[PDB]
């Protein structure tokens, strides 16, 4: 069908809270060849975030049941495999349709951050060596997104903050470096506050919510 309607069905999907359908529509809209607008971009991450979120939660529930004293493992693996399917789909979509397929610094950072997040999820369920490879491909994506944000965006831009937030989660929960996670989260927060004045009602609500998430993490981490 037409890109215009694909976009329309995703909005409907999100309304009816049918994220799997929503992610599929967006995927069809992406393969249409044309770049996505800011609005479209968010539809894409919201759809896939919800789909993958359910699987990640399922996985965590199961793996904990497995560790806490045959079926558990077999089922955890099924969920895990299904989760890796989605991540490879998102990553493929990014590598051959979205990443640097545009010009804007915001669109570029957004896509590279998304690449970091999905490699990060793949890292949550991987084991020895395969994990090291995945972890390193996650970091290079975050770092490249970080380099672009620090040169192209003010310290309060919500995308830059979302990126810095998730990159700190990466340091703490994946790269096993609590030290680095805490300082980046703290450094991102301060430089954010120090500019909050006249942050324009534009991205106010978003950056404000991410700033709170940064704090929650700092508290939980310390």
């Amino acid at each position: 069908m037409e890109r215009a309607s694909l976009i329309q069905k995703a909005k409907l999907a999100e309304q009816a809270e049918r994220y799997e359908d929503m992610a599929a529509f967006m995927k069809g809209a992406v393969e249409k060849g044309e770049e996505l607008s800011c609005e479209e971009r968010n539809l894409l991450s919201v759809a896939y975030k919800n789909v993958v979120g359910g699987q990640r939660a399922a996985w965590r529930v199961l793996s904990s049941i497995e560790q806490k004293s045959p079926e558990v493992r077999e089922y955890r693996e099924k969920v895990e495999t299904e989760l890796q399917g989605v991540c490879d789909t998102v990553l493929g979509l990014l590598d051959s349709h979205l990443i640097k397929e545009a010009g804007d610094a915001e669109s570029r950072v957004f896509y590279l951050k998304m690449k970091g997040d999905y490699y990060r999820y793949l890292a949550e369920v991987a084991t020895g060596d395969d994990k090291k490879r995945i972890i390193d491909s996650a970091r290079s994506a975050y770092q490249e997104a970080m380099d672009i944000s620090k040169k192209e965006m003010p310290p309060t831009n919500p995308i830059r903050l979302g990126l810095a937030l998730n990159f700190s989660v990466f340091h703490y929960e994946i790269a096993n470096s609590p030290e680095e996670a805490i300082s980046l989260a703290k450094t991102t927060f301060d430089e954010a506050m120090a500019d909050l004045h006249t942050l324009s009602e534009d991205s106010y609500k978003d950056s404000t919510l991410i700033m709170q998430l940064l704090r929650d993490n700092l508290t939980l981490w310390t």
């Binding site: 979302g162 937030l165 998730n166 989660v169 929960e173 919510l209 998430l213 929650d216 939980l220």
Partner: peptide, 9 residues
Amino acid sequence: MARSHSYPA
């Protein structure tokens, strides 16, 4: 450690 927060959520 009760899972940290990421964005979007």
